[PDB]
Coordinates of C-alpha atoms and ligand atoms in Angstrom, one line a residue:
Chain A
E1 CA 110.3 93.9 110.6
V2 CA 108.4 95.2 107.5
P3 CA 110.0 95.0 104.0
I4 CA 109.4 97.3 101.2
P5 CA 106.0 96.0 99.7
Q6 CA 107.0 93.3 97.4
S7 CA 104.1 93.6 94.8
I8 CA 104.4 97.3 94.1
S9 CA 106.0 98.8 91.0
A10 CA 109.8 98.8 90.7
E11 CA 109.5 102.6 90.4
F12 CA 107.7 102.9 93.7
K13 CA 110.0 100.5 95.3
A14 CA 112.9 102.7 94.3
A15 CA 111.1 105.7 95.6
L16 CA 110.6 104.1 99.0
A17 CA 114.1 102.9 99.3
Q18 CA 115.5 106.4 98.9
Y19 CA 114.0 107.9 102.0
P20 CA 115.3 106.8 105.4
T21 CA 112.5 105.4 107.5
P22 CA 112.0 108.5 109.5
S23 CA 111.8 108.6 113.2
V24 CA 108.4 108.4 115.1
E25 CA 110.4 109.8 118.0
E26 CA 111.6 112.8 116.2
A27 CA 108.2 113.4 114.4
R28 CA 106.4 113.2 117.8
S29 CA 108.7 115.7 119.6
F30 CA 108.5 118.2 116.7
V31 CA 105.8 120.7 117.9
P32 CA 105.9 124.4 117.4
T33 CA 104.6 126.4 120.4
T34 CA 105.4 130.1 119.6
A35 CA 104.4 132.4 116.8
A36 CA 108.1 132.5 115.5
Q37 CA 108.3 128.8 115.5
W38 CA 105.1 128.3 113.4
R39 CA 106.1 131.1 111.0
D40 CA 109.5 129.7 110.4
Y41 CA 108.3 126.2 109.9
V42 CA 105.8 127.3 107.4
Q43 CA 108.0 129.9 105.5
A44 CA 110.9 127.4 105.2
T45 CA 108.8 124.5 104.1
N46 CA 107.1 126.7 101.5
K47 CA 110.4 127.8 100.1
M48 CA 111.6 124.4 99.6
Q49 CA 108.4 123.4 97.9
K50 CA 108.4 126.4 95.4
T51 CA 111.4 124.9 93.6
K52 CA 109.5 121.6 93.0
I53 CA 106.6 123.5 91.6
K54 CA 108.8 125.6 89.1
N55 CA 110.2 122.3 87.8
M56 CA 106.7 120.8 87.5
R57 CA 105.4 123.7 85.8
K58 CA 108.2 123.7 83.2
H59 CA 108.1 119.8 82.9
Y60 CA 104.4 119.7 82.0
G61 CA 104.3 123.0 80.1
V62 CA 101.1 124.2 82.0
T63 CA 100.3 127.8 82.1
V64 CA 99.7 129.2 85.5
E65 CA 97.8 132.4 85.7
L66 CA 97.5 134.3 89.0
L67 CA 94.0 135.7 89.7
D68 CA 92.0 137.4 92.4
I69 CA 88.5 136.1 92.7
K70 CA 86.5 138.2 95.2
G71 CA 89.6 138.8 97.3
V72 CA 90.7 135.2 97.1
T73 CA 94.0 134.3 95.5
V74 CA 93.4 131.6 92.8
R75 CA 95.8 130.1 90.3
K76 CA 94.4 129.0 87.0
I77 CA 96.4 126.1 85.5
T78 CA 95.9 125.2 81.8
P79 CA 97.5 122.1 80.2
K80 CA 99.0 122.1 76.8
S81 CA 96.0 120.3 75.5
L82 CA 92.5 119.6 76.8
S83 CA 90.6 116.3 76.8
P84 CA 87.5 116.8 74.6
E85 CA 85.3 115.1 77.2
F86 CA 86.0 118.0 79.5
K87 CA 85.0 120.8 77.1
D88 CA 83.1 123.4 79.1
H89 CA 83.9 121.8 82.4
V90 CA 86.4 123.0 85.0
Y91 CA 88.0 121.6 88.0
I92 CA 88.5 123.4 91.4
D93 CA 91.4 122.1 93.4
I94 CA 91.7 122.6 97.2
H95 CA 95.2 121.8 98.2
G96 CA 96.5 120.0 101.3
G97 CA 99.1 120.9 103.9
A98 CA 97.5 120.1 107.2
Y99 CA 95.9 123.5 107.3
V100 CA 99.3 125.4 107.7
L101 CA 101.4 124.6 104.7
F102 CA 101.8 125.4 101.1
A103 CA 100.3 128.9 100.7
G104 CA 101.3 130.7 97.5
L105 CA 102.8 128.9 94.5
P106 CA 103.5 125.7 96.5
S107 CA 99.6 125.2 96.6
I108 CA 99.4 124.0 93.1
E109 CA 101.2 120.6 93.1
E110 CA 98.2 118.4 92.6
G111 CA 96.6 121.0 90.5
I112 CA 99.4 120.6 87.9
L113 CA 98.9 116.8 87.9
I114 CA 95.2 117.1 87.6
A115 CA 95.3 119.6 84.7
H116 CA 98.0 117.7 82.8
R117 CA 96.8 114.1 83.5
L118 CA 93.1 114.9 83.1
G119 CA 93.5 117.5 80.4
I120 CA 91.2 119.9 82.2
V121 CA 91.5 123.6 83.4
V122 CA 92.1 123.7 87.1
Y123 CA 91.5 126.7 89.5
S124 CA 93.6 126.1 92.6
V125 CA 92.4 127.9 95.6
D126 CA 95.1 129.6 97.7
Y127 CA 93.0 129.8 100.9
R128 CA 93.9 131.6 104.2
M129 CA 95.5 129.5 107.0
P130 CA 96.5 129.8 110.6
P131 CA 98.3 131.0 112.6
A132 CA 97.0 134.4 111.1
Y133 CA 93.7 133.0 109.7
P134 CA 92.2 130.0 111.7
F135 CA 88.9 128.4 110.9
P136 CA 86.5 129.4 109.2
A137 CA 88.7 131.6 107.0
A138 CA 89.7 128.7 104.6
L139 CA 86.0 127.7 104.3
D140 CA 84.9 131.2 103.6
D141 CA 87.5 131.5 100.8
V142 CA 86.3 128.3 99.0
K143 CA 82.7 129.5 99.2
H144 CA 83.6 132.9 97.7
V145 CA 85.5 131.3 94.8
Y146 CA 82.9 128.6 94.1
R147 CA 80.1 131.3 94.2
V148 CA 81.9 133.1 91.2
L149 CA 82.9 129.9 89.2
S150 CA 79.5 128.3 89.6
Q151 CA 77.8 131.3 88.0
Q152 CA 80.3 131.5 85.2
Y153 CA 80.3 127.7 84.4
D154 CA 77.2 126.2 85.9
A155 CA 77.4 123.9 89.1
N156 CA 76.8 120.8 86.9
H157 CA 79.9 121.7 84.9
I158 CA 82.1 121.9 88.0
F159 CA 84.3 119.2 89.4
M160 CA 86.0 119.7 92.7
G161 CA 88.8 117.9 94.4
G162 CA 91.4 118.0 97.2
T163 CA 94.0 116.0 99.0
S164 CA 94.4 115.7 102.8
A165 CA 93.3 118.9 104.6
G166 CA 92.0 120.1 101.2
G167 CA 90.0 117.0 100.9
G168 CA 88.4 117.6 104.4
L169 CA 87.8 121.2 103.6
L170 CA 86.1 120.1 100.5
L171 CA 83.7 117.7 102.2
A172 CA 82.9 120.4 104.8
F173 CA 82.2 122.9 102.0
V174 CA 79.9 120.6 100.1
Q175 CA 78.0 119.7 103.4
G176 CA 77.4 123.5 103.8
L177 CA 76.2 123.9 100.2
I178 CA 73.7 121.1 100.7
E179 CA 72.3 122.4 104.1
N180 CA 72.0 125.8 102.5
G181 CA 70.1 124.6 99.5
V182 CA 72.9 125.6 97.0
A183 CA 73.5 123.4 93.9
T184 CA 76.5 121.2 94.3
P185 CA 79.5 120.4 91.9
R186 CA 78.8 117.6 89.3
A187 CA 81.2 115.2 91.1
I188 CA 84.1 115.4 93.5
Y189 CA 87.4 113.7 94.6
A190 CA 88.8 113.4 97.9
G191 CA 92.3 112.1 98.1
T192 CA 93.3 110.7 101.6
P193 CA 91.0 113.4 103.2
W194 CA 91.6 114.8 106.7
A195 CA 87.9 114.0 107.5
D196 CA 88.3 113.9 111.3
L197 CA 90.8 116.2 113.2
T198 CA 90.5 114.0 116.4
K199 CA 92.7 110.9 116.8
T200 CA 89.9 108.6 116.2
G201 CA 90.6 106.7 112.9
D202 CA 92.1 103.3 113.7
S203 CA 94.9 103.6 111.2
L204 CA 96.3 106.7 113.0
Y205 CA 97.3 104.2 115.5
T206 CA 98.0 101.1 113.5
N207 CA 99.9 102.8 110.6
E208 CA 101.9 105.0 113.0
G209 CA 105.6 104.6 111.9
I210 CA 104.4 102.8 108.7
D211 CA 102.9 105.8 106.9
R212 CA 106.2 107.4 105.7
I213 CA 104.6 110.8 105.1
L214 CA 102.4 111.5 108.1
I215 CA 104.4 109.2 110.6
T216 CA 102.3 110.0 113.7
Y217 CA 99.4 112.2 114.8
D218 CA 101.3 113.2 118.0
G219 CA 103.6 116.0 116.6
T220 CA 102.8 118.6 114.1
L221 CA 99.7 117.0 112.8
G222 CA 97.7 117.1 116.0
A223 CA 99.2 120.5 116.7
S224 CA 98.1 121.8 113.3
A225 CA 94.6 120.7 113.8
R226 CA 94.4 122.5 117.1
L227 CA 95.8 125.7 115.6
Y228 CA 93.3 125.6 112.8
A229 CA 90.4 124.9 115.2
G230 CA 91.2 127.5 117.8
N231 CA 88.4 127.4 120.4
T232 CA 86.0 125.3 118.2
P233 CA 85.6 121.7 119.4
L234 CA 87.5 119.4 117.0
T235 CA 84.3 117.3 116.3
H236 CA 82.5 120.3 114.8
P237 CA 81.5 119.1 111.3
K238 CA 83.0 121.9 109.4
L239 CA 86.4 120.9 111.0
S240 CA 85.6 117.1 110.9
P241 CA 83.1 116.4 108.1
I242 CA 82.9 112.8 109.1
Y243 CA 80.5 114.1 111.7
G244 CA 78.4 115.9 109.3
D245 CA 75.6 114.5 106.9
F246 CA 76.4 113.1 103.5
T247 CA 72.8 112.9 102.3
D248 CA 72.6 114.4 98.6
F249 CA 76.3 114.3 98.1
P250 CA 77.5 114.2 94.4
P251 CA 79.3 111.1 93.2
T252 CA 82.7 110.9 95.0
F253 CA 86.0 109.2 94.1
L254 CA 88.1 108.5 97.3
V255 CA 91.7 107.5 97.3
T256 CA 93.8 106.0 100.0
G257 CA 96.4 103.3 100.6
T258 CA 97.0 100.3 102.8
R259 CA 99.9 102.2 104.8
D260 CA 97.9 105.5 105.0
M261 CA 97.3 106.8 108.5
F262 CA 94.2 108.4 107.0
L263 CA 93.1 105.0 105.5
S264 CA 90.4 104.7 108.4
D265 CA 89.1 108.1 107.9
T266 CA 88.9 107.7 104.2
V267 CA 86.9 104.5 104.6
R268 CA 84.7 106.0 107.2
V269 CA 83.7 108.7 104.8
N270 CA 83.1 106.1 102.2
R271 CA 80.8 104.1 104.5
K272 CA 78.8 107.0 105.6
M273 CA 78.4 108.2 102.0
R274 CA 77.2 104.7 100.9
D275 CA 74.8 104.6 103.9
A276 CA 73.3 107.8 102.6
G277 CA 72.9 106.5 99.2
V278 CA 75.8 108.4 97.6
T279 CA 77.5 107.0 94.6
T280 CA 81.2 106.4 95.4
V281 CA 84.2 104.8 94.0
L282 CA 86.9 103.7 96.6
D283 CA 90.4 103.2 95.2
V284 CA 92.9 101.8 97.8
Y285 CA 96.6 101.3 96.7
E286 CA 98.7 98.5 98.0
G287 CA 101.7 99.7 100.1
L288 CA 100.9 103.4 99.7
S289 CA 101.2 106.0 102.5
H290 CA 99.3 109.4 102.8
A291 CA 99.4 111.3 99.6
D292 CA 102.2 109.0 98.2
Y293 CA 100.6 109.5 94.7
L294 CA 101.7 113.2 95.1
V295 CA 105.0 112.7 96.9
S296 CA 106.2 110.2 94.4
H297 CA 104.2 111.2 91.3
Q298 CA 106.3 109.6 88.5
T299 CA 105.2 106.1 89.4
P300 CA 102.7 103.7 87.8
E301 CA 100.7 103.9 91.1
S302 CA 100.4 107.7 90.8
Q303 CA 99.5 107.5 87.1
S304 CA 96.9 105.1 88.0
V305 CA 95.2 107.3 90.6
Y306 CA 94.8 110.1 88.0
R307 CA 93.7 107.7 85.2
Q308 CA 91.0 106.2 87.3
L309 CA 90.0 109.7 88.5
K310 CA 89.8 110.8 84.9
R311 CA 87.6 107.7 83.9
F312 CA 85.4 108.5 87.0
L313 CA 84.8 112.2 85.9
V314 CA 84.5 111.4 82.2
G315 CA 81.5 109.2 83.3
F316 CA 79.6 112.4 84.5
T317 CA 80.2 114.6 81.5
Chain B
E1 CA 98.7 102.5 121.7
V2 CA 96.3 100.2 119.9
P3 CA 92.9 100.9 121.5
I4 CA 89.7 99.3 120.4
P5 CA 88.7 101.3 117.3
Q6 CA 86.7 104.2 118.7
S7 CA 84.2 104.7 116.0
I8 CA 82.9 101.2 115.5
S9 CA 79.6 100.1 116.9
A10 CA 79.0 99.3 120.4
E11 CA 78.1 95.7 119.4
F12 CA 81.5 95.2 117.6
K13 CA 83.3 96.9 120.4
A14 CA 81.9 94.4 122.8
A15 CA 82.8 91.6 120.5
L16 CA 86.5 92.7 120.3
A17 CA 86.8 93.4 124.0
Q18 CA 85.6 90.0 125.0
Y19 CA 87.5 88.0 122.4
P20 CA 90.8 86.5 124.0
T21 CA 93.1 87.2 121.1
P22 CA 96.3 84.9 120.8
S23 CA 99.6 86.7 120.8
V24 CA 101.8 86.4 117.6
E25 CA 104.2 84.2 119.5
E26 CA 101.4 81.8 120.6
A27 CA 100.0 81.6 117.1
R28 CA 103.6 80.8 115.8
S29 CA 104.1 78.6 118.9
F30 CA 103.0 75.7 117.0
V31 CA 101.6 74.2 113.8
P32 CA 100.7 70.7 112.8
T33 CA 103.4 68.9 111.1
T34 CA 102.0 65.3 111.1
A35 CA 98.7 63.5 110.5
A36 CA 97.8 63.2 114.2
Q37 CA 98.3 66.9 114.5
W38 CA 96.4 68.1 111.3
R39 CA 93.5 65.8 112.0
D40 CA 93.4 66.8 115.7
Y41 CA 93.5 70.5 114.9
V42 CA 90.8 70.2 112.3
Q43 CA 88.4 68.1 114.3
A44 CA 88.7 70.4 117.4
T45 CA 88.2 73.5 115.4
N46 CA 85.3 72.1 113.3
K47 CA 83.5 71.0 116.5
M48 CA 83.3 74.6 117.7
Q49 CA 82.1 75.9 114.3
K50 CA 79.4 73.1 114.2
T51 CA 78.0 74.6 117.3
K52 CA 78.0 78.2 115.8
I53 CA 76.2 76.8 112.7
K54 CA 73.4 74.9 114.5
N55 CA 72.7 78.1 116.5
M56 CA 72.7 80.3 113.5
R57 CA 70.4 78.0 111.7
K58 CA 67.9 78.1 114.6
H59 CA 68.3 82.0 114.9
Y60 CA 67.7 82.7 111.2
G61 CA 65.3 79.9 110.6
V62 CA 66.7 78.8 107.1
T63 CA 65.9 75.3 105.8
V64 CA 69.0 73.3 104.9
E65 CA 68.8 70.3 102.4
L66 CA 71.6 67.9 101.9
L67 CA 72.4 67.2 98.3
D68 CA 74.8 65.2 96.3
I69 CA 75.8 66.7 92.9
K70 CA 78.0 64.3 90.8
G71 CA 79.4 62.9 94.1
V72 CA 80.0 66.5 95.6
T73 CA 78.3 67.3 98.8
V74 CA 76.3 70.5 98.5
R75 CA 73.8 72.1 100.9
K76 CA 70.9 74.0 99.6
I77 CA 69.8 76.8 102.0
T78 CA 66.4 78.4 101.7
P79 CA 65.5 81.5 103.8
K80 CA 62.1 81.9 105.3
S81 CA 61.7 85.1 103.2
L82 CA 62.7 85.3 99.5
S83 CA 63.5 88.6 97.8
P84 CA 61.3 89.1 94.7
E85 CA 64.3 90.5 92.7
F86 CA 66.1 87.3 93.2
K87 CA 63.2 85.1 91.7
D88 CA 64.9 82.4 89.4
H89 CA 68.4 83.6 90.6
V90 CA 70.5 81.5 92.8
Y91 CA 73.9 81.9 94.7
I92 CA 76.7 79.5 94.9
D93 CA 78.7 79.8 98.1
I94 CA 82.4 78.6 98.4
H95 CA 83.2 78.5 102.0
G96 CA 86.4 79.7 103.7
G97 CA 88.6 77.8 106.2
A98 CA 92.3 78.1 104.9
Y99 CA 91.7 75.1 102.6
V100 CA 91.6 72.8 105.7
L101 CA 88.8 73.8 108.0
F102 CA 84.9 73.6 108.1
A103 CA 84.1 70.6 106.0
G104 CA 80.6 69.3 106.6
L105 CA 77.9 71.2 108.3
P106 CA 80.3 74.0 109.4
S107 CA 80.7 74.9 105.8
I108 CA 77.5 76.8 105.6
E109 CA 78.2 79.9 107.9
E110 CA 78.3 82.5 105.3
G111 CA 75.7 80.7 103.1
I112 CA 73.2 81.1 106.0
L113 CA 74.0 84.8 106.2
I114 CA 73.6 85.2 102.4
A115 CA 70.4 83.3 102.1
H116 CA 68.7 85.3 105.0
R117 CA 70.2 88.7 104.3
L118 CA 69.8 88.7 100.6
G119 CA 66.8 86.5 100.5
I120 CA 68.2 84.1 98.0
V121 CA 68.5 80.4 97.5
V122 CA 72.0 79.3 98.3
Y123 CA 74.0 76.3 97.2
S124 CA 77.0 75.8 99.5
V125 CA 79.8 73.6 98.1
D126 CA 81.2 71.2 100.7
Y127 CA 84.5 70.7 98.6
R128 CA 87.3 68.2 99.3
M129 CA 90.3 69.4 101.3
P130 CA 93.8 68.3 102.5
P131 CA 95.4 66.5 104.0
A132 CA 93.4 63.7 102.2
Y133 CA 92.5 65.7 99.0
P134 CA 95.1 68.6 98.2
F135 CA 94.9 70.9 95.2
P136 CA 93.2 70.6 92.7
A137 CA 90.5 68.5 94.3
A138 CA 88.5 71.5 95.7
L139 CA 88.6 73.2 92.3
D140 CA 87.5 70.1 90.5
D141 CA 84.5 69.8 92.9
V142 CA 83.5 73.5 92.2
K143 CA 83.8 72.7 88.5
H144 CA 81.5 69.8 88.8
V145 CA 78.8 71.7 90.8
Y146 CA 78.8 74.7 88.4
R147 CA 78.4 72.5 85.3
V148 CA 75.2 71.0 86.8
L149 CA 73.8 74.2 88.2
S150 CA 74.6 76.3 85.2
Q151 CA 72.7 73.9 83.0
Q152 CA 69.8 74.1 85.5
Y153 CA 69.6 77.9 85.9
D154 CA 71.6 79.5 83.0
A155 CA 74.9 81.3 83.9
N156 CA 73.3 84.7 83.8
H157 CA 71.0 83.7 86.7
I158 CA 73.9 82.5 89.0
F159 CA 75.7 84.6 91.4
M160 CA 78.8 83.1 93.2
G161 CA 80.7 84.3 96.2
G162 CA 83.2 83.0 98.8
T163 CA 85.3 84.3 101.7
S164 CA 88.9 83.8 102.4
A165 CA 90.1 80.5 100.8
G166 CA 86.7 80.2 99.3
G167 CA 87.2 83.6 97.7
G168 CA 90.6 82.6 96.3
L169 CA 89.1 79.4 95.0
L170 CA 86.2 81.3 93.3
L171 CA 88.7 83.7 91.6
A172 CA 90.8 80.7 90.3
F173 CA 87.6 79.0 89.2
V174 CA 86.3 82.0 87.3
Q175 CA 89.7 82.5 85.6
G176 CA 89.5 78.8 84.4
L177 CA 86.0 79.3 83.0
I178 CA 87.2 82.3 81.0
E179 CA 90.4 80.6 79.6
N180 CA 88.1 77.7 78.4
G181 CA 85.5 80.2 76.8
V182 CA 82.8 78.8 79.3
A183 CA 79.9 81.4 80.3
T184 CA 80.7 82.8 83.7
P185 CA 78.3 83.7 86.5
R186 CA 76.3 87.1 86.3
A187 CA 78.4 88.7 89.1
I188 CA 80.5 87.5 92.0
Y189 CA 81.5 88.4 95.6
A190 CA 85.0 87.8 97.2
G191 CA 85.2 88.4 100.8
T192 CA 88.7 89.0 102.1
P193 CA 90.0 86.5 99.5
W194 CA 93.1 84.4 99.9
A195 CA 94.3 85.6 96.5
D196 CA 98.0 85.0 97.0
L197 CA 99.2 82.0 99.2
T198 CA 102.7 83.5 99.4
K199 CA 103.7 86.0 102.1
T200 CA 103.6 89.0 99.6
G201 CA 100.7 91.3 100.6
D202 CA 102.0 94.1 102.7
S203 CA 99.2 93.9 105.2
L204 CA 100.4 90.3 106.1
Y205 CA 103.4 92.2 107.8
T206 CA 101.7 95.5 108.8
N207 CA 98.6 93.9 110.3
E208 CA 100.4 91.1 112.0
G209 CA 99.4 91.2 115.7
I210 CA 96.5 93.5 114.7
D211 CA 94.3 91.3 112.7
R212 CA 92.5 89.3 115.6
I213 CA 91.5 86.4 113.4
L214 CA 94.6 85.5 111.3
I215 CA 97.2 87.0 113.7
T216 CA 100.3 86.0 111.6
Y217 CA 101.0 84.2 108.4
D218 CA 103.9 82.3 110.0
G219 CA 101.7 79.7 111.9
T220 CA 98.9 77.4 110.8
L221 CA 98.0 79.8 107.9
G222 CA 101.2 79.5 106.0
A223 CA 101.3 75.7 106.8
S224 CA 97.8 75.3 105.5
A225 CA 98.7 77.0 102.2
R226 CA 101.7 74.5 101.9
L227 CA 99.5 71.5 102.7
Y228 CA 96.9 72.5 100.1
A229 CA 99.6 73.2 97.5
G230 CA 101.6 70.0 98.0
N231 CA 104.4 70.1 95.4
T232 CA 102.8 72.8 93.3
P233 CA 104.7 76.2 93.6
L234 CA 102.6 78.6 95.5
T235 CA 102.5 81.3 92.8
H236 CA 100.6 78.8 90.4
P237 CA 97.6 81.1 89.5
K238 CA 95.0 78.4 90.4
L239 CA 96.5 78.6 94.0
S240 CA 97.2 82.3 93.9
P241 CA 94.8 83.8 91.4
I242 CA 96.4 87.2 91.9
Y243 CA 99.0 86.0 89.3
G244 CA 96.3 85.0 86.8
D245 CA 94.4 87.3 84.3
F246 CA 91.3 89.1 85.3
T247 CA 90.2 90.2 81.8
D248 CA 86.5 89.5 81.1
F249 CA 85.6 88.9 84.8
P250 CA 82.0 89.4 85.7
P251 CA 81.2 92.4 88.2
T252 CA 82.7 91.7 91.4
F253 CA 82.1 92.9 94.9
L254 CA 85.0 92.9 97.2
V255 CA 85.0 93.3 101.0
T256 CA 87.8 93.7 103.5
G257 CA 88.7 95.9 106.5
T258 CA 91.4 98.2 107.7
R259 CA 92.8 95.7 110.2
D260 CA 92.6 92.7 107.8
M261 CA 95.8 90.9 107.0
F262 CA 94.3 90.2 103.6
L263 CA 93.7 93.9 103.1
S264 CA 96.5 93.9 100.7
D265 CA 95.5 90.8 98.7
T266 CA 91.9 92.2 98.4
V267 CA 93.1 95.6 97.0
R268 CA 95.7 94.0 94.8
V269 CA 92.8 92.0 93.2
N270 CA 90.8 95.1 92.9
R271 CA 93.6 97.0 91.2
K272 CA 94.1 94.3 88.6
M273 CA 90.6 93.9 88.0
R274 CA 90.1 97.6 87.4
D275 CA 93.2 97.6 85.1
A276 CA 91.6 94.9 83.0
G277 CA 88.3 96.9 82.7
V278 CA 86.3 94.8 85.1
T279 CA 83.4 96.4 87.1
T280 CA 84.1 96.3 90.8
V281 CA 82.8 97.6 94.0
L282 CA 85.3 97.8 96.8
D283 CA 83.9 98.0 100.4
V284 CA 86.4 98.5 103.2
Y285 CA 85.3 98.5 106.9
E286 CA 86.9 100.5 109.6
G287 CA 88.7 98.5 112.3
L288 CA 87.7 95.1 110.8
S289 CA 89.9 92.0 110.7
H290 CA 89.9 89.1 108.3
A291 CA 86.3 87.8 108.0
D292 CA 85.2 89.8 111.1
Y293 CA 81.7 90.2 109.5
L294 CA 81.4 86.5 109.8
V295 CA 82.9 85.9 113.2
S296 CA 80.9 88.6 114.7
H297 CA 77.9 88.5 112.5
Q298 CA 75.4 90.1 114.8
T299 CA 76.8 93.7 114.3
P300 CA 75.8 96.6 112.4
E301 CA 79.0 96.3 110.4
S302 CA 78.2 92.7 109.4
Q303 CA 74.6 93.7 108.4
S304 CA 76.1 96.4 106.4
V305 CA 78.4 94.2 104.4
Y306 CA 75.3 92.0 103.2
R307 CA 73.1 95.0 102.7
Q308 CA 75.7 96.4 100.3
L309 CA 76.2 93.0 98.6
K310 CA 72.5 92.8 98.1
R311 CA 72.2 96.3 96.5
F312 CA 75.1 95.2 94.2
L313 CA 73.7 92.0 93.1
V314 CA 70.1 93.3 92.8
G315 CA 71.5 95.7 90.1
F316 CA 72.3 92.7 87.9
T317 CA 69.0 90.8 88.0
Ligands
LIG1 CL1 98.5 117.5 104.4
LIG2 CL1 84.4 101.1 94.7
LIG3 CL1 90.0 81.2 106.0

């Protein structure tokens, strides 16, 4: 069949060995259909994640300050020391979770890694999600936070980033800034972005059962897309920003992996950006699934992701 | 459950639909193990490729001149229209063919595309191959041709590129220049390089039966590696340049695709280059198999490859 990737770090090999190869069958059949089933999936998953966040916060020694910005919950994450290159810049993090998971403290996982590994202050947006708040609630929240932080720091001193759903939301958001004539962030990061909610990217098929994190589109992933979308067609560019326009995008850093089910959508975004004359850096990791650099963040591969992101953003300071 | 990639061009869809792709079992089914077999296989395959070349020549209207450079056959390819930015620059092409295919006129397939689409004079090296001339004959040939051309043009006015085996050979060649303190070419291109002759890259397993050009390692591909290597262990860095040092490499453009069995080798090379401070641009195409931009060159995808390569190299003139 398929061995653990032989050329990856021994640390990452150990990480992969410790999860059983989960079941495509069991992932496909897991689909909430009632309000109580969605609520409990979300609440139980978030409770599990909150413990990880507490440990990470203590480990890296970051401060986490709970704010309200124009009615949006935001957590400001400050590392023990800051990189001099990022003086007077800040980073706005848009978390992932397939548009249904990781509200509250669980939202700040990547935000902690960014703050600590880049040495930059991070504002992680705790945006609204279905079932209660489907599209466009999350987009409205990001807009309202950016309007405040852009006035306080200047657009050209703001970096933004997000993984997975947060990456897709970010692309949709920047598309909206551009079509409304509003100044964009200096540079952005999209980690394995959910750039198309439909089952269109080839790797959704070919890395089914290979991506150890997403596993398949056909269970909660597609169902989470439909819940977020409501009666909006899934090809609407603010749901699926691959279908929007990338003209005038700020320089973008895109991360994915050879086993990632969102490999295709990440490279589709890269291609459409380059065709629009956008500056991009694509960084694809051997052997890596969707967001593996988050899931297994104490690996050389994870360190590499944030090292290369730092080098990229430093270039625009 | 593996549909034709839905977002690729109509032209590339027609190309994939109409191609009769061998099963993995067929491609394993057999493999030359004697002289009759290797010579028969090579001749038959080369005959078909010769047809493609004669037709591409006619279609693109390039001029081909037959050269002998220190006993090495080289074909000089001049397009009907030259790009002004490439005045006094030339390109050296190192063809692919798994180190056994496409000697003779068949060798110039990518050289034609490069000459026409970049508008640059191309020297395509017709290097010696097994079974008659195993490693290091091809590498010696490239060495000889570069010495003469570098004298003629200056190294900073030479670009070099290669696809598949030719890409691997070019990486090995450039490592050798650097360890001997010899001035390297200005910038280089490696298209889906064979950077590791062992079955190590994860995509050799995961894109088995998905990559429509290579299909599987475990047929003629792995056999061709062993024929080329002879009794040299496959991890020798001049066979498998992923195991060499990429420090001081010139800026490199790397191309691959999400279905490519050499996706992994390509991104492994990219990661070692970036870790060694090398400037790279990585361009991954949705839905594309090994060298699909050559096999199906009359597609928007293929045009995009060379458009992006041209942009990259023009930046270094
Ligand atoms: Cl997610
Ligand atoms: Cl890149
Ligand atoms: Cl080849």
